[PDB]
Design a protein around this ligand. Structure first.
Ligand SMILES: CCCCCCCCCCCCCCCCCC(=O)OC[C@H](CO[C@@H]1O[C@H](CO[C@H]2O[C@H](CO)[C@H](O)[C@H](O)[C@H]2O)[C@H](O)[C@H](O)[C@H]1O)OC(=O)CCCCCCCCCCCCCCCCC
Ligand code: CLA
Ligand code: CLA
Ligand code: CLA
Ligand code: CLA
Ligand SMILES: CCCCCCCCCCCCCCCCCC(=O)OC[C@H](CO[C@@H]1O[C@H](CO)[C@H](O)[C@H](O)[C@H]1O)OC(=O)CCCCCCCCCCCCCCCCC
Ligand SMILES: CCCCCCCCCCCCCCCCCC(=O)OC[C@H](CO[C@@H]1O[C@H](CO)[C@H](O)[C@H](O)[C@H]1O)OC(=O)CCCCCCCCCCCCCCCCC
Ligand SMILES: CCCCCCCCCCCCCCCC(=O)OC[C@H](COP(=O)(O)OC[C@@H](O)CO)OC(=O)CCCCCCCCCCCCCCC
Ligand SMILES: CC1=C(/C=C/C(C)=C/C=C/C(C)=C/C=C/C=C(C)/C=C/C=C(C)/C=C/C2=C(C)CCCC2(C)C)C(C)(C)CCC1
Ligand SMILES: CC1=C(/C=C/C(C)=C/C=C/C(C)=C/C=C/C=C(C)/C=C/C=C(C)/C=C/C2=C(C)CCCC2(C)C)C(C)(C)CCC1
Ligand SMILES: CC1=C(/C=C/C(C)=C/C=C/C(C)=C/C=C/C=C(C)/C=C/C=C(C)/C=C/C2=C(C)CCCC2(C)C)C(C)(C)CCC1
Ligand SMILES: CC/C=C\C/C=C\C/C=C\CCCCCCCC(=O)O
Ligand code: OEX
Ligand SMILES: [Cl-]
Ligand SMILES: [Fe+2]
Lengths: 34, 342, 107, 336, 80, 449, 60
């Protein structure tokens, strides 16, 4: 059961870190406006 | 225009603030009488002698609890004319006997007929297509099946809906307790149609309002439109791409979009009307025989359907005594179904 | 296609309200105009196709046209004597009504 | 030309050329929704009975355990657990996990996160395509309704067992018990929500019929008008002036909408506000603020009670109240 | 445009309009108040006054059982 | 004022015409603050004038008076109101200060300078000037930290605050040893929000509250000083939208979270919201009902420990899913409740059978009965009891009002944050007024599959 | 007892960490993603054809 908890924690933190550091990567500049 | 018909048609189909038309002669009197009957019944007429309740502002009821009540079950399906063999020309005793309900219903049906006729006539005068008149068939069918066909297949007008808020709520709860109306596939289609129509309305409004075109310099975008303009005011290509990438499918035809918008709620209401027509003869999808047999043989089998059955049983047993005074049901407290400590 | 002068909006005293009702604004057609948030204008004005179609929706179907108002109605014909008679009548009717309401009730 | 691994990944994630947009909210949305979907399907097909009331009375809800589509459901978590977090790794075994109602909590949590990310992704694609970002604001009404029926009501009632089951007959049971305990039909917010859905259907039919009635002739009688419309065309395909004239002669001139933008904003605004208010009503009733109680309100001169339709509704509520849980009560008051 | 009637904005801002209608609306309000307070509402539409719900004869709710003698039955039930 | 002719904003969006007018915006904000203080004072005066001493606070529909009672003003041992003069003083002071605030707002909105960027450079600002906005943020952070420290000083030196867990019944104590342990403070903050944990709502003594307030005051003062002396870094300039509407959306989201937290705290907490002034909570009423029925049935000669219910689980006492001895029935979901009248009967492994068999006190029984009858259930027209009751009792719990109102406010302000964040992101990019017909972005992309 | 379990629900742990392995997993994954982002954040900024001065960002 501890292995499942470790695996789920790893997956969740991976996806949340992806979300955070993707929205930190100059997101407002990705628009078609001139 | 020299003939009587020609001059009458010239005056009736005139350009006016309120269009009268040939159908006005049927619509306006009946609609006015129905509205007046409802207001008079909710304000002054009571329901003490026909139902055993109080249903007027004069007796101390608010907007929610005031209603025009149905006649007693002894009257059967009598049309209850003011001059009929029951009231016999007495206005006060006609009001006391419940004749205002039949008055309102019979005038309202003809008002609905007149309104569809008015839609047809106005559409023909302006030289367009009668799809708005076709769309009113769903409300008319709902009214006909709920207020006429269902009571006509029952003991009498006593089991018809009463024109009020709390009266309609009681009608809904009665339909749940006795008919298991929530478990009817036709009602399920009706619910799906109504909710899908609301979804379509909201989504179309938002999509049109959020794909507009820059036709002005002000932040208030309502002033960048002109009804006689040629170009469309929003980007169908952009809307289609957005909804294709978000949802998976999207509209590419405005005519098909708007016909679907028309089609969904009408079909839902018609299906619910068919369901109520079937329910008028107590042809209710009430139970699953396999589930009942399995629960009877095995005292461990339980699903949500059995719990709903028990709830319906409780509703019937505890509402029967007061909702149907004619049956004269006297129930000792020890025969009413009850749970533990509740 | 639409003549703004024939839409019956010429009898309005407030110039800003008059311009609002026709869907026009002289300020916004300037190329240097900046709205409260700070966005420059492209010179379109209130409506882009104002010249092509005559006017805006506001200048197409107004709901307040003082020009079409009746010439009478801005002056009471009965004059001061009519107003005095009205005052006497309303005082008498108010007294009668309050007396009837008090008398018919349970005090 | 992108060179870094992260730069290339960001360009792919925020790409508008994908068949389905991913975005940064979709990064959260896709795995949570896939997890909830998988668990929902597997539990709906083959899950063991779940003890929902905590009185050791399991309730079956699976197709493999004698149910059909109408009867099958996903039974909420046990009443013994309450509001406690019950992840799959807090159980001694999967047999114990399935017996107490774990899949319901799993699906509910993942679904909540997924719908929030879905609304965020709607905003994101609106921004990337150059649109105005309020279709996401429209979606907030169903999002709030789902949150109220799945999260806020268990939050205020102290247990996930009072949550709405993931089934049809379970939904009906939830509605009936909600009426018996809170008198939802008498709540002004529920009345506003009903007005919202009824008006939404009315206006959807009205708009569809008016637009379909003013189509300009571009075809023959052996083909549909949908073939008369061409995708990407610049000219309008129906007569707004003709439709406005018809409606303004139907009711009166100043009741119809001469502005297409204003009409579509009204269409968007009505049902959204209605659903907002009905969700607020459900959330308010979670904290035990029920509807109007006009019971024994009309009293005659000597003090006796004159009944009313409200009293008939009260009798029905009493009928469906003493039976909503037969053996789960030991004391006279249902304070929860 | 206009269908050939006086605009509502023109009428509602008229001294003549507000002189005529400073009498009619209060007169109707007082007429309704007097209709209710004088007991006419009870007598015309047959609603029970608070002291007439239960008589000394019967202390239960009324019940009509005959369809063709309904007039006489409701006359008997309403007896004070 | 202005008009749509020279602004482009309609009358229903007229407050957007003063986005770039610093003086008028300041006047509007000052007037709104005056309105808030006016409501506080007027409501306090209304509640103090309609208060009778023969009924408890929660039975009379009061929501501002229990806030002053928890600060130790005009209350005595056991939670009984003794003096009602400080409430009057507070209301009068608020009402009088509202006049000064309103005059300042009216002056700054009507005849004050329209744009204070040329005559008052210290107070002037530009929405796109990051340094000035950060400086203002730091100043207000310092002010908030001073307010938190002002709250801290009350519980220490100026008479203290009401403590519902004090030995010998609740009374106004003085907090001498606040908990400033990093492990204790971080335990509340990074706790789960689910049952049993409860996040920060689960704070169960006033020492933790005072320690957390010391922490928050120090943090706010340090952060204000940090922001006054610095400017946003590159990673912050690369991630945010810098406009007034964007800042408004950020604040809206923050205060929506705050509103949801306030709703949950009002519904669930018992330390900062004593039941003596707010009435019983949700779980508290159920536990009280089970306790009083157990006491009554024990007085009738019954064995409560060995009594078996209809389901075979235990009528009065059962076991929680982890082992603790808890009350039986449907109140088995509320076993996480912890109240001052129930803790003395609880041992290390749950409820003590001997303690509740021989050492139950009459004051505990009275508290249980009172909290049983005054359950937080009611109707919209203020009718106490379940939905299937009669019109006999005019009561709705103060917890219900606060919880419902603040949940509604939190949801609506979340929706407002969504609206304003979207509009700010669109307007900064430059397509908030629609799509450009000449250059439509979609027409330049390759078609999908 | 009959069986064994983690026995951690309803305790009040920081981030739900009862074992240091969860902390190690969280920290390792976060650090890996942060390092990957940190290497490329210089290149990402240069796509705007502007320098990250005090006037950088989306402003109005
Ligand atoms: C950093 C980002 C987040 C990371 C974590 C995210 C996890 C997401 C998981 C998926 C599911 C969604 C979240 C479920 C939350 C359930 C909250 C709950 O069961 O309970 C909420 C808890 C209450 O905790 C309670 O706290 C109580 C406190 O205990 C003690 O409290 C007092 C202490 O003195 C008394 O002594 C009392 O007797 C004693 O019991 C008890 O412990 C209870 O058992 C315990 O449940 O509140 C709180 O955590 C405080 C308020 C929390 C936030 C607001 C919640 C409400 C709003 C929901 C979201 C918005 C909806 C509207 C918008 C919709 C559209 C977008
Ligand atoms: C505009 C059309 C209109 C219509 C369609 C109706 C329809 C109806 N009314 Mg309403 N009503 C109206 C206007 C209308 N009303 C008006 C203006 C009033 C005055 C306030 C009323 C007052 C009223 C009352 C008081 C009652 C009704 C009720 C009813 C029903 C009458 C049943 C009946 O037997 O009719 C009569 C039958 C007919 C078939 C008539 C048609 C006969 C044709 C024209 C032949 C003519 C031949 C004849 C031998 C020669 C006459 C010519 C010569 C005298 C000049 C019916 C549902 C009853 C009710 O609802 O009960 C519940 C009732 O009690 N109505
Ligand atoms: C919360 C309160 C509130 C506040 C403080 C403001 C504040 C402001 N509004 Mg906004 N507004 C609000 C709500 C509010 N508004 C609402 C609900 C709407 C929708 C109807 C609007 C719509 C709106 C529009 C359409 C406009 C403003 C504008 C203005 C600003 C200019 C004032 C002015 O020129 O006219 C003030 C006009 C008058 C002379 C009336 C004076 C009446 C006084 C102020 C009443 C208060 C006095 C009180 C009874 C006693 C206090 C005295 C003290 C000793 C106790 C002002 C800062 C204007 C603007 O944009 O400026 C550029 C403008 O164009 N507002
Ligand atoms: C260093 C100087 C300075 C100082 C001392 C303040 C201080 C204050 N400002 Mg700020 N402000 C400043 C610079 C400054 N400001 C500048 C340069 C601007 C740009 C024009 C603003 C814009 C501004 C606005 C628009 C508003 C304020 C408000 C306030 C008050 C908020 C506190 C409150 O709500 O009480 C509650 C909180 C407390 C913690 C209790 C007080 C505890 C004491 C201080 C200890 C506070 C008096 C708000 C207000 O309240 O106006 C009356 C308001 O609406 N400020
Ligand atoms: C009024 C509230 C407030 C607000 C609105 C801001 C706003 C801002 N801060 Mg300031 N700050 C504040 C108070 C506030 N701060 C306080 C009280 C402190 C002292 C700790 C600081 C210290 C501070 C630093 C050191 C930095 C900022 C920075 C910034 C900017 C970056 C935005 C950001 O947070 O990234 C979005 C948020 C995140 C990606 C995650 C943050 C959430 C944290 C990690 C949660 C856990 C808390 C943390 C471990 C603290 C311990 C908890 C406590 C019990 C001790 C932004 C202008 C940055 C900057 O630009 O400076 C010029 C920066 O580097 N702030
Ligand atoms: C819904 C669409 C509109 C439908 C018609 C509404 C008006 C019908 C008549 C109401 C009336 O006269 O009530 C009159 C009643 C009279 O009030 C009653 O008088 C009695 C006298 O014996 C008793 O004193 C009752 O206690 C008292 O409630 O007032 C009410 O019920 C109060 C509500 C006030 C009006 C509410 C209108 C409906 C709700 C708002 C709808 C639009 C929302 C936007
Ligand atoms: C705070 C920094 C935020 C940075 C930006 C984040 C952007 C959003 C990212 C995605 C967020 C949603 C998904 C999160 C999934 C992982 C979390 C999870 O499931 O934890 C679930 C775990 C459950 O942990 C459980 O613990 C038990 C013992 O207590 C047992 O050990 C269980 O085995 C264990 O699973 O809970 C936590 O990790 C606690 C999280 C506490 C968070 C405190 C945040 C404080 C600062 C913010 C305050 C406001 C927060 C919002 C409040 C209002 C909301 C309406
Ligand atoms: C990551 C993505 C996240 C969200 C995923 C969403 C998945 C669902 C998509 C469904 C598309 C199906 C459309 C069929 C028909 C189809 O091909 O649609 C395509 C149709 C094409 O329109 P056109 O303008 O091209 O038509 C031109 C005319 O000439 C047609 O005659 O567009 C629509 O009608 C949109 C309405 C879809 C409404 C679907 C609602 C959901 C249906 C019910 C689901 C039941 C589930 C049961 C499970 C047991
Ligand atoms: C019966 C009858 C008849 C008839 C009669 C009539 C036709 C009547 C009418 C009547 C009427 C015609 C009435 C009316 C009434 C009305 C009312 C009573 C109203 C009210 C209103 C209100 C209350 C309102 C409210 C509101 C407000 C204020 C706000 C907003 C919303 C609303 C709008 C809702 C006859 C003799 C022929 C014959 C025999 C039988
Ligand atoms: C600008 C503007 C606005 C706003 C405004 C405002 C918001 C204001 C406010 C204001 C205010 C906010 C004010 C206040 C005032 C106050 C006062 C004036 C007070 C007084 C008091 C007193 C006098 C007292 C007395 C007493 C005592 C001493 C004791 C006890 C008893 C008594 C209570 C009697 C508006 C919206 C219109 C719009 C336009 C613009
Ligand atoms: C007084 C008191 C206390 C204490 C408290 C404290 C000490 C607190 C703290 C608190 C805190 C310290 C908090 C914090 C929070 C934070 C947050 C809530 C954040 C957020 C963030 C965000 C939302 C972000 C976003 C983003 C992303 C993710 C990406 C990119 C973009 C951006 C940046 C936008 C206690 C409980 C002991 C007890 C009672 C009393
Ligand atoms: C090179 C030295 C420099 C810096 C290192 C400083 C501090 C390291 C401290 C702790 C690292 C391990 C952290 C463990 C967190 C708690 C885990 C648990 O709760 O089991
Ligand atoms: O679980 Mn589901 O429903 Ca909430 O109330 Mn109490 O518990 Mn049971 O009863 Mn009623
Ligand atoms: Cl119980
Ligand atoms: Fe449309």
């Amino acid at each position: 059961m501890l292995t499942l908890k470790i695996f789920v924690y790893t997956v969740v933190t991976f996806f949340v870190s992806l979300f955070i550091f993707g929205f930190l990567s100059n997101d407002p500049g990705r628009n078609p406006g001139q | 225009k020299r003939g009587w018909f020609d001059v009458v048609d010239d005056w009736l189909r005139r350009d006016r603030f309120v269009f009268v038309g040939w159908s006005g002669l049927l619509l306006f009197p009946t609609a006015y009488l129905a509205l007046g009957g409802w207001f008079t019944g909710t304000t002054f007429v009571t329901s003490w002698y026909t139902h055993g309740l109080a249903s007027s502002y004069l007796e101390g009821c608010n907007f929610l609890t005031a209603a025009v009540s149905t006649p007693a079950n002894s009257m059967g399906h009598s049309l209850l004319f003011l001059w009929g063999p029951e009231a016999q020309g007495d206005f006060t005793r006609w009001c006391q006997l419940g004749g205002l309900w039949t008055f309102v219903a019979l005038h309202g049906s003809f008002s609905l007929i007149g309104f569809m006729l008015r839609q047809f006539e106005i559409a023909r005068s302006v030289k367009i297509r009668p799809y708005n008149a076709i769309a009113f068939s769903a409300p008319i069918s709902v009214f006909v099946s709920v207020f006429l066909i269902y009571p006509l297949g029952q003991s009498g007008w006593f089991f018809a809906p009463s024109f009020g808020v709390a009266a309609i709520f009681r009608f809904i709860l009665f339909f749940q307790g006795f008919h298991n109306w929530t478990l009817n596939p036709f009602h399920m289609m009706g619910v799906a149609g109504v909710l899908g129509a609301a979804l379509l309305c909201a989504i179309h409004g938002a999509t049109v309002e959020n794909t507009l075109f820059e036709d002005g310099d002000g932040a208030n975008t309502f002033r960048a439109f002109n009804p006689t303009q040629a170009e469309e005011t929003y980007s169908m290509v952009t809307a289609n791409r957005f909804w294709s990438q978000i949802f998976g499918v999207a509209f590419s035809n405005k005519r098909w979009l708007h016909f679907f918008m028309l089609f969904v709620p009408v079909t839902g209401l018609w299906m619910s009307a068919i369901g109520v027509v079937g329910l008028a003869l107590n042809l209710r999808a009430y139970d699953f025989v396999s589930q009942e047999i399995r629960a009877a043989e095995d005292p461990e089998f339980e699903t949500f359907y059995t719990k709903n059955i028990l709830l319906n049983e409780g509703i019937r047993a505890w509402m029967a005594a007061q909702d149907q005074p004619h049956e004269k049901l006297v129930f000792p407290e020890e025969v009413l179904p009850r749970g533990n400590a509740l | 296609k639409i003549d703004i002068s024939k839409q019956g909006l010429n009898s309005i005293q407030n110039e800003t309200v008059k311009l609002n009702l026709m869907g026009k604004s002289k300020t916004m057609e300037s190329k240097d105009w900046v709205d409260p948030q700070g966005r420059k204008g492209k010179g379109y004005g209130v409506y882009r196709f104002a010249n092509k179609y005559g006017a805006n929706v506001d200048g197409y179907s107004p709901i307040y046209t003082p020009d079409t108002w009746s010439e009478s109605g801005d002056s009471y014909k009965l004059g001061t004597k009519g107003l005095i008679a009205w005052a006497g009548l309303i005082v008498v009717l108010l007294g009668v009504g309050i007396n009837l309401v008090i008398s018919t009730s349970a005090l | 030309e992108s060179t870094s691994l992260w730069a290339r990944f960001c360009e792919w994630v925020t790409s508008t050329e994908n068949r389905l947009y991913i975005g940064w909210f979709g990064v959260l949305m896709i795995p949570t929704l896939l997890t909830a979907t998988s668990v929902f399907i597997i539990a709906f097909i083959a899950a063991p009975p779940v003890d929902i009331d905590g009185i050791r009375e399991p309730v079956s809800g699976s197709l493999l355990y004698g149910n059909n589509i109408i009867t099958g459901a996903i039974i909420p978590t046990s009443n013994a657990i309450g509001l406690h977090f019950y992840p799959i790794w807090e159980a001694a075994s999967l047999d114990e996990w399935l017996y107490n109602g774990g899949p319901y909590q799993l699906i509910v949590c993942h679904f909540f996160l997924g719908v929030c990310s879905y609304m965020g992704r709607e905003w994101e694609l609106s921004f990337r395509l150059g649109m105005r970002p309020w279709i996401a604001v429209a979606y907030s009404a169903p999002v709030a309704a789902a949150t109220a029926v799945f999260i806020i009501y268990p939050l205020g009632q102290g247990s996930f067992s009072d949550g709405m089951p993931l089934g049809i007959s379970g939904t009906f049971n939830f509605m009936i018990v909600f009426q018996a305990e809170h008198n939802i039909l008498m709540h002004p917010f529920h009345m506003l929500g009903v007005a919202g859905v009824f008006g939404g259907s009315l206006f959807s039919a009205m708009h569809g019929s008016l637009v379909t009635s003013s189509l300009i002739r571009e075809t023959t009688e052996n083909e549909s008008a949908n073939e008369g419309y061409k995708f990407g065309q610049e000219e309008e395909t129906y007569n707004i002036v003709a439709a406005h004239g018809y409606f303004g002669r139907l009711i009166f001139q100043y009741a119809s909408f001469n502005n297409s933008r204003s009409l579509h904003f009204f269409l968007a605004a009505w049902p959204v506000v209605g659903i907002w208010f009905t969700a607020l009503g459900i959330s308010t009733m979670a904290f035990n603020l029920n509807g109007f109680n006009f019971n024994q309100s009309v009293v005659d001169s000597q003090g006796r009670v004159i009944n009313t339709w409200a009293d008939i509704i009260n009798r029905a509520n009493l009928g469906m109240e003493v039976m909503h849980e037969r053996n789960a009560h030991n004391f006279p008051l249902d304070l929860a | 445009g206009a269908t050939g009637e006086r605009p509502f904005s023109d009428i509602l801002t008229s001294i003549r309009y507000w002189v005529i209608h400073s009498i009619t609306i209060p007169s109707l309000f007082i007429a309704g108040w007097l209709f209710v307070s004088t007991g006419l509402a009870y007598d015309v539409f047959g609603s029970p006054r608070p002291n007439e719900y239960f008589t000394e004869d019967r202390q239960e709710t009324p019940l009509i059982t005959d369809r063709f003698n309904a007039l006489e039955q409701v006359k008997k039930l309403s007896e004070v | 004022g202005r008009d749509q002719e020279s602004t482009g904003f309609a009358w229903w969006a007229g407050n957007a015409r003063l986005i770039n007018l610093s003086g008028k915006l300041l006047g509007a904000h000052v007037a709104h603050a005056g309105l808030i203080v006016f409501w506080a004072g007027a409501m306090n005066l209304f509640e103090v004038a309609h208060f009778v001493p023969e009924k408890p606070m929660y039975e009379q529909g009061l929501i501002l008076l229990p806030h002053l009672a928890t600060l130790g003003y005009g209350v005595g041992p056991g939670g009984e109101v003794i003096d009602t003069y400080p409430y009057f003083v507070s209301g009068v002071l608020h009402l009088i200060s509202s006049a000064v605030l309103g005059f300042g707002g009216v002056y700054h909105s009507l005849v004050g300078p329209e744009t204070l960027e040329e005559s008052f450079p210290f107070f002037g600002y530009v929405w796109k000037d990051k340094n000035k906005m950060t400086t203002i943020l730091g100043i207000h952070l310092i002010v908030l930290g001073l307010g938190a420290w002002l709250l801290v000083w009350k519980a220490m030196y100026f008479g203290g605050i009401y403590d519902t867990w004090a030995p010998g019944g609740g009374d106004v104590r003085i907090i001498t040893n606040p908990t400033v342990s990093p492990g204790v403070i971080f335990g509340y903050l990074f706790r789960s929000p689910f049952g049993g944990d409860g996040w920060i709502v689960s704070v169960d003594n006033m020492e933790d509250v005072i320690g957390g307030h010391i922490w928050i005051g120090t943090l706010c003062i340090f952060g204000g000083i940090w922001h006054i002396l610095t400017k946003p870094w590159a990673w912050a300039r690369r991630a945010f939208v810098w406009s007034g509407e964007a800042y408004l959306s950020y604040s809206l989201g923050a205060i929506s979270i705050m509103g949801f937290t306030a709703c949950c705290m009002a519904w669930f907490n018992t330390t900062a919201y004593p039941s003596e002034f707010y009435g019983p909570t949700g779980p508290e009423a159920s536990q009280s009902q089970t306790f009083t029925f157990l006491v009554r049935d024990q007085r009738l000669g019954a064995n409560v420990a060995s009594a078996q219910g209809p389901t075979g689980l235990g009528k009065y006492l059962m076991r929680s899913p982890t082992g603790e001895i808890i009350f039986g029935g449907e109140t088995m979901r509320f076993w996480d409740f912890r109240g001052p009248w129930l803790e003395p009967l609880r041992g290390p492994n749950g409820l003590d059978l001997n303690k509740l068999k021989n050492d139950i006190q009459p004051w505990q029984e009275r508290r249980a009965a009172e909290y049983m009858t005054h359950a937080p259930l009611g109707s919209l027209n203020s009718v106490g009891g379940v939905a299937t009751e009669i019109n006999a009792v005019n009561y709705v719990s103060p917890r219900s009002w606060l919880a419902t109102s603040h949940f509604c406010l939190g949801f609506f302000f979340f929706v407002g944050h969504l609206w304003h964040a979207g509009r700010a992101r669109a307007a900064a990019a430059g397509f908030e007024k629609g799509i450009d017909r000449d250059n439509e972005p979609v027409l330049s992309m390759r078609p999908l599959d | 007892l009959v069986d064994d379990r983690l026995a951690g629900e309803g305790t009040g742990k920081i981030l739900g960490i009862n074992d240091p392995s969860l902390f190690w997993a969280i920290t390792i994954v976060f650090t890996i993603v942060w390092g990957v982002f940190y290497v490329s954040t210089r290149e990402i900024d240069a796509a705007s054809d502007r320098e990250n001065d005090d006037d950088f960002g989306l402003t109005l």
